[PDB]
Amino acid sequence: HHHHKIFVFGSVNVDVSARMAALPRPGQTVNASGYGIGLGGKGANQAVAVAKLGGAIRFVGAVGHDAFGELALKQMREFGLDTGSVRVIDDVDTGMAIIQVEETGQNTIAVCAGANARWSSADIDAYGADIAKARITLLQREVPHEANLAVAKAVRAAGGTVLLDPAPVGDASQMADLIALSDIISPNETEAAEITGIEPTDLASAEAAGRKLLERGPKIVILKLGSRGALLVTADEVKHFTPFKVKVVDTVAAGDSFNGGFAVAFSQARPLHDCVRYGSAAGAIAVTRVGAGAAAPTAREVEELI
Amino acid sequence: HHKIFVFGSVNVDVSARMAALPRPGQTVNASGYGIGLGGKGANQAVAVAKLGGAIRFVGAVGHDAFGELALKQMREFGLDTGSVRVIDDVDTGMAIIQVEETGQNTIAVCAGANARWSSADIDAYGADIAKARITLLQREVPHEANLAVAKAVRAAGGTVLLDPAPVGDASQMADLIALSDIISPNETEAAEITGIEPTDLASAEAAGRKLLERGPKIVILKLGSRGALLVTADEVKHFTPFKVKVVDTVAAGDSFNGGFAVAFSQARPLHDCVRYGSAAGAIAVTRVGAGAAAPTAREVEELIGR
Amino acid sequence: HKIFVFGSVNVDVSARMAALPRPGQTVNASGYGIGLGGKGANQAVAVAKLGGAIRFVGAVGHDAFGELALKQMREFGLDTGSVRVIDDVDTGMAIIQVEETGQNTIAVCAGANARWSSADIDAYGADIAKARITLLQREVPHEANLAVAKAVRAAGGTVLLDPAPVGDASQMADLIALSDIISPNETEAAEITGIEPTDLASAEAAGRKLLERGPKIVILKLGSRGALLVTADEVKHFTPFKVKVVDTVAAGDSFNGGFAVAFSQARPLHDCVRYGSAAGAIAVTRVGGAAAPTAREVEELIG
Amino acid sequence: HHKIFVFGSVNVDVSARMAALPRPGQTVNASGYGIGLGGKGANQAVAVAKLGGAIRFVGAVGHDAFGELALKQMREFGLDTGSVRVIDDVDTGMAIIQVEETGQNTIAVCAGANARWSSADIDAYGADIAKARITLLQREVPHEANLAVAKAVRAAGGTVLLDPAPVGDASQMADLIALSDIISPNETEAAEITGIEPTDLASAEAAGRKLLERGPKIVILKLGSRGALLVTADEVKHFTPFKVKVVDTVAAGDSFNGGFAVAFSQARPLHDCVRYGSAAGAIAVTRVGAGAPTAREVEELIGR
């Protein structure tokens, strides 16, 4: 066995996805050609991504005591994720999202916090042992802010590393004090646009956007630029990482794969450059497929691409 | 082998309340959701069961969790589920309902196992159709299977109650209506089938007389807030609505049809049958959903005495 | 008026000869006759001569054959006041040539019978509504028959359909769906249901098939073997009356008129099938019909 | 009175246009039909009447519906039906011609009342036949009755124009021809009577001269599209056809004989009589069916 070097705290959802010819207009009933139900949520997705890439992973999230919660746990373990630290809350509904997708790819999403919204800064104290010994710690913005803050404080207290995915941006000022406690931050084009006000329209403006993030507490900024690669910005360097050429199929939650892959290399003490490249390759393989379950990138697939 | 026979769809309704529906490309935060039994066939069969009618229900669900939930809730409402097909390798039909604060909704329905029905399959139920004093049909299952049920009833000298919802292809249902002894369209369905919008009792009668030409001998125009209108070759009677507190009018027609079906199997006069459905619909609007809040015989008789 | 008949009017040019002529040949005919024809006028006359209160609705051309058809109708007791005379069209007409052995060749011109439209039927909305039973055949445009059937349905009447000639089976599946009573014979039931009624066991099977298509009452005309009544609730075999057989053409058209008359008089259903069965048997004993069975004759046969 | 006397068959013609003849046991549909007066007797009698001839037509019909209609059609054509015998207990003559879209025809003919004539029946018309300047006959009634009419004309010194159509028993008509003063066969009939096929004017004269051996003094070979050829013991003259737009050539011979007989009854020169029949036949082809050319049309064509 292996000590848990990566700690992920974040949301657990059951995603109900439907494919249809046309999205329903207000007041309209339409037909869909099919649907699926699978594990979802920024927390569980990133934790799974770390697991499929070989990381020693400890995921902490909450499901309800209901049929969707039993489904979320059953999937995560089918995905090699130990659910020992996943809270089961009786008298709350499991978080869950409604995803409607039409032929052209346009979609509408609606998310119910469910068991994710029950986290308090006090509930985090129970995991301070696991957090304090974790080499890197992944957060998102799909759980209550006081709970994310409590994790970030604990990490600073132990002198660890907080990787923050600032997604969804939400209240930008409310996350200003979360970013201050983060050690690494990985915004995409939109998120960096709201946090700094600078739209990363090209590589010169994206470097200016990253240098503004250096002023807010993070020491490493990794601007996820989608099809145009990634930009690593620090006080001491700026390096563009060329995107990997792949057949694009479904680009949803590629960033979630990116953070996971980065966190696995980081937990392995690989040099920072190798960490960014491992994340960018994990994201590249994540677009070549549909979904982030069994189709999530593995170490074998990623390293062959590299 | 029961005096009332319902053949139709079984859905699972994933309803999601939220402040505003998502515009295309948008993510929204919903305030909560529920999962429950739906479908026009399962609604109407449950409405008969809760009103004390002896009913045999025929429908299909997948061998998945949503199938298990539909079967279990059917039993909870008094419906015997022994004639419900459980088809492997096919998802239970499901509907994604998004409900706004203002009230505007948005539905997306996946046929699911409901689409697996064939005219061949109906031969396995010829026994139950023979003993049926009335047979309820809707438009949420393959047309050839609806037609096969209709032929069995007509050969057996029974009675067919056709809810023409959704209208779909009105020309395709021309033959199903031809074999339908009783047809119960609401305002919209009457206007689409005949081209006459029932804006008043004069016009509603005219739409009903246009339907008499197509095979039915009894037409029951459901007018929502204005009650119903019985039209036949011999009489026109307008049934006033019962004064009730309106809360959620969805599927008020489904409870009206089960109310009529039960009173019909009880050999009650035709007028009494329509009144029973008119009361059962009235109770259906006073509560939310059909489910375990579906009208009971106790409640209906109370409303007629009032 | 309690019986409404909407159908074809023909003039039947019938010729008898020892052998039918081959292409390009000229033969001599031992004789010929000319009489009223067409499934519509035959049934309408059979009802008239049996004492029914009937309104016949047919079309004839404004030519000599039109005046021959109207004249012969009036002498059989049928009021022709509702028979349209159409200018610039020929009356319906059928040449029949008969060989000594019986092999016959027929050529039919639709004439005025093809001029009926579904809009033309609105002029008879009041008649159709007041009728207790309405007799229809397949010798007029399908759109016109459907208009009549829709009128009866709206009014709650009864539609007696003789599916003759069978013609396009698919086109008339929807005329059957609006029919209350259907009266196919052996050959017609075979084509419609795909079941040959070669005996009473298979005849019931075919009749049950027809019950799946809209009619509630099926009366299989079985020729020399009587008729079979098939409904959701009963099956009865109506044995034929023993009679000397002379010419069996259009015996079914007197059976349908006999049923119509008894039905219009509110007699029990079995009594209506027997009354039609007697009228058919009386028809076979004579040629053509100028001697269409009468109520007096039919009642004598039942006793 | 009535200088021109015609005796022969009266028919009603039911003609049905249709696409493919019915096979035994089949029921076909026909695009349409017409119904009109028929029979070579009535056809020629109507031809004379419409051309201004004083005509007394004698024919037999049944006491049935097609009789009344045959009589009604005659009157509208301008033919007096006072001498048409109506026999009760017999069918009127009738034919059923079923044409095809390819041309094939199936004809069934019931002789009807036409077969009832006897040699005795003719004596009731001994007066009329005597006054007859000319007498038209055909081969569609009993032979015994044709002979009796001929004997009556010969006994009064009149004239007997015989249309030898249909030929039928060529041998049985050797004695009707001998009582005939004028004979007007077409190509097929002349070939079947004399044995000479009239393919060209020389061979047609050879056929006519053989016919002169059998009693007729005048022979008029109706050559169809090439006119007609007059053959007698003293002369042979070809009568060129009139150039006309051909449409339907059926029974143009009947319009020819009637036109000749009208000119003959008016005492016109023999050549003028033949040319009048040539013109009447030319007009008859330009249309479909009888009422057949009129005198105004025949003169218009002759002088065109």
Place this chain on the structure above:
Amino acid sequence: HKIFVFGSVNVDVSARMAALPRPGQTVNASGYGIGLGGKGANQAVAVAKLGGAIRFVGAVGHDAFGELALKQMREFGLDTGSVRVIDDVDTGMAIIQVEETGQNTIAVCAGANARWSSADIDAYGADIAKARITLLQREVPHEANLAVAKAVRAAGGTVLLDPAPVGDASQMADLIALSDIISPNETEAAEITGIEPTDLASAEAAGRKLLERGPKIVILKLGSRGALLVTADEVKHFTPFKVKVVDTVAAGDSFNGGFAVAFSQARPLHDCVRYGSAAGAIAVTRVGAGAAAPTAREVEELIGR
């Protein structure tokens, strides 16, 4: 020539006796005579003796009776160029046995007269065409008489038919139909039509029956009572001329020759019948046919008396 005669040529063996022989008996006769005979020859000689331009076609054998026949005809003015002489056949000849009371008995061998065939008549198409009138009888093969009558009909001429002997009444029905003039005596009219002409009323009815059979002119030879002209336009009775009667044999043959001769001369029909009536009366005043045959001078004298 303008008159054509086709018919029989006989040598008549006439024997007189008191009583005809009964079967098996042998009886003496008081005399006999041999001379020309036959209906073809008799009418041909009468035409020649009355001055008419005549072409006679008959057949005789190459035997003595043929040479006798031929010599007599030339003795009476008849050119015999067109008389066939067939070898291997006996000249036509009749056996006449006459009682002293008047009755008589005749047995006729056809001889060369029977050798005529329809084909043989093609050789006289030229002579037939030039003929104004053609005289026929019933003493030659029927197919040959028809062949001639067809040639006259096609040529537009006239066929005078003497329906004698009557023989098969159905066989001569179609010879009468091609005949323009017919001159039966009382008995011949009786068998052809069925009406016995016992007087002028019944004689006319017999003539009108013959008018139905094709001929345009009927001349009923009534013997001692004259003749009757019957046509579709007129009926005229020609009284007999008063003459002393001696032997009336073949008086009809002289009547047909008289009519023929006047016809070829284009005299009116009435005058042709009277010319025959006069010639017939002259014939009865004398005995025999060729010798008794009248002449133009004898006829005109009688007509002018």
Place this chain on the structure above:
Amino acid sequence: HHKIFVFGSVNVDVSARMAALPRPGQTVNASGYGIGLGGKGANQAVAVAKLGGAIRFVGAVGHDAFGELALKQMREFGLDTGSVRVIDDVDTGMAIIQVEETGQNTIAVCAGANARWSSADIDAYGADIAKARITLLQREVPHEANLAVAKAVRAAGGTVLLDPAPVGDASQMADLIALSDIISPNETEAAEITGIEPTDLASAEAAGRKLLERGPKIVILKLGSRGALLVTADEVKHFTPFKVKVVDTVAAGDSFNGGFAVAFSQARPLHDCVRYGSAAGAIAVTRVGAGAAAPTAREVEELIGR
């Protein structure tokens, strides 16, 4: 190009000694007075210079007599004044100190030029800040100016030593502490910031751990006569006080920060930096005044080797 950057307040101190503090409306005589350099900015800069550190000092004085005086005394204490801004139309900062023989102090402070600093004014010193190994801030200048400097250091990957003195509004400076790599609060300032009174080494440590939660990686609790406590995520070490003849303990913390900065800028181990400022603090209390009488490298090393 200097290895230490100090930014802060500059004051002229008018110190007056008398027997009794005047009461309102009263005029008392003072035995003597002196006029010298002051302000936490200048004090820390002067101590750095007097200990041998290469320092660039940034502060503001007016264009008046006290501006010339402060500049003159800075140059005497070894401090290059090239980068001290001189602002026209504003007085030089100045405190008025009246101290009794008994020992009761009384201070009235005019902000003067010190309050003119803005966040924009800091952009002129981005070059110096980027080259600085360590940077010292205090709480005697506008807050947005200190935050501007701290952001500039974060961008350049430098180090920010924060003296949280005067604490003032602790909530205001929570975002400045997040940018502060090293923080050196005394007992009173630690109690205000965290809420824990450092009465002994257990409570002092607990306050230090609570301060690590707010972003700083190194905490140095100045305990005065009881030494100092170094607290980090990896270690806790109590640095015993050097035995010295206490005379005047005023501004001993400023000498402690100057000593730490100097030994930090020479790359001495962390422990050797804490003891360097421990010794410089001890010397500072044996004498009066933190100007010409500031400790020196010779003095500090001699105490460390005593």
